[model samples]
Target: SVGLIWAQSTSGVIGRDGGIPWRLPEDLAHFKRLTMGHTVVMGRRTWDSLPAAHRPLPGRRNVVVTRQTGLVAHGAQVVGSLEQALSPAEPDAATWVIGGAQIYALALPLANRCEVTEVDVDLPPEDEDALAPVLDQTWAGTSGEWLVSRSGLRYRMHSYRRL
Candidate 1:
């Protein structure tokens, strides 16, 4: 099954200037717990945004979609097309659509579930032409599948299923 996973602010902002806007440890732990051992598919920029030490993220099978033919990812598979990245978990193994906005947009429709951590921050608009990460604007629709709702100290996690 394919699942979409992300943590966003109250204003729908996921990241900015190549990183997440806020640092909520609980949310970070939530992300790691959800995505571990899955096949993670992300875009080139997302791959690059990782810290220099954590390039290929440890346990998961990392697949990066990039146009650069000779991109040398330390531990992830680099593919030119979405199809190639997806082939790793086509029929069975769980796949997570990890982000960098564009990849998230393309993969959302294919997701069988969505795990979102909704934070309570409202960010002002970015002035540039979206050179860096921009606010995510695609969190709507197809809402009635299944939902597991809960709240922590300052965040809430809503996990949904399509089946």
Candidate 2:
């Protein structure tokens, strides 16, 4: 299964100056817990932004999507495309698509599940470079469901199976 996850502020600020807009430690903890044993896919920039200790999120297969050469992390694998990243994930086991912006746009179509932390606010246009595309309504049919919510932050975990 392919899973996509992200946290955005109410103002629609997913990232600010190249980082998350809010620091929801609890939400991050929850993210780490849920994706621990899964395979995570991210863009080069996202990979570069990770703290040394968090680079290769322990217990999971970390796959970085990049066209750059020689990118390396202790337990992470580098793949040139999303297709390559998802190639090794078992149908039963989850393959998570973590992000920056471009990575999410590409993987959203292939994702079977989406874990979105919707902040109850909106951001000014200046703050956003280019917003990620909304999941295609046609593909998301009858599958949008709420999994959890807290601290003015609402998270919906949605799942869709290709027909």
Candidate 3:
């Protein structure tokens, strides 16, 4: 299944200044555990946002989707499009799409599972400009089979099977 996972903070902020705002060690750990030994798909910016030490995301296949040519990161294969980024994974493999707004927006329609950690805070209207577009509601009926809430965050792990 293709899994899309992200965590935001109490202020409805996923990234602050340039990176994630909250200190959700548990959430990060959960991400690591779930994604390790699997293939991860992300945009160039998401790959860049990671700390240098966390570069390879150890034991996972890294596929960076970008239009830029010759962009390379250690242990990552750069692909020109999302289709190419996802081409390497087998049908049954757990491919995780980790992201920033643009990448998430591009992948949301195609994603089979969405693992989102929702926060309670409302964003200022200005901040909404940076938000990912509302996911296609047509797919909602067949998505998000699992929902979990903890530590002031509500997360839904959704799966959409192509009909």
Candidate 1, residues 43-129: lDDT per residue as tens digits? 998898887766888888888999999989889988988767777644537888888678877776677678777776557657531
Q: How does model 3 fare in lDDT?
A: 0.69
Better of 2 and 3 by TM-score: 2
TM of each candidate vs. truth: 0.80, 0.78, 0.76
Off by over 4 Å in 3: 10-12, 89-92, 121-133, 139-163
How many residue pairs clash per model? 0, 7, 1
Displacement of residue 20 (Cα, Å) in model 3 is: 0.7
Off by over 4 Å in 1: 89-92, 128-153
* lDDT tens per residue, model 2, 1-163: 7878776654455666666655566568868987987788898888877778887777888889889767665678888898988887444377888887888888877877777665444566464543544765545534344444455554543344444
* lDDT tens digits, residue span 1-110, model 3: 67677765434456655577545455687789888988888888788888878787788888888899888677898899988877774453789888877888777777
Better of 1 and 2 by lDDT: 1
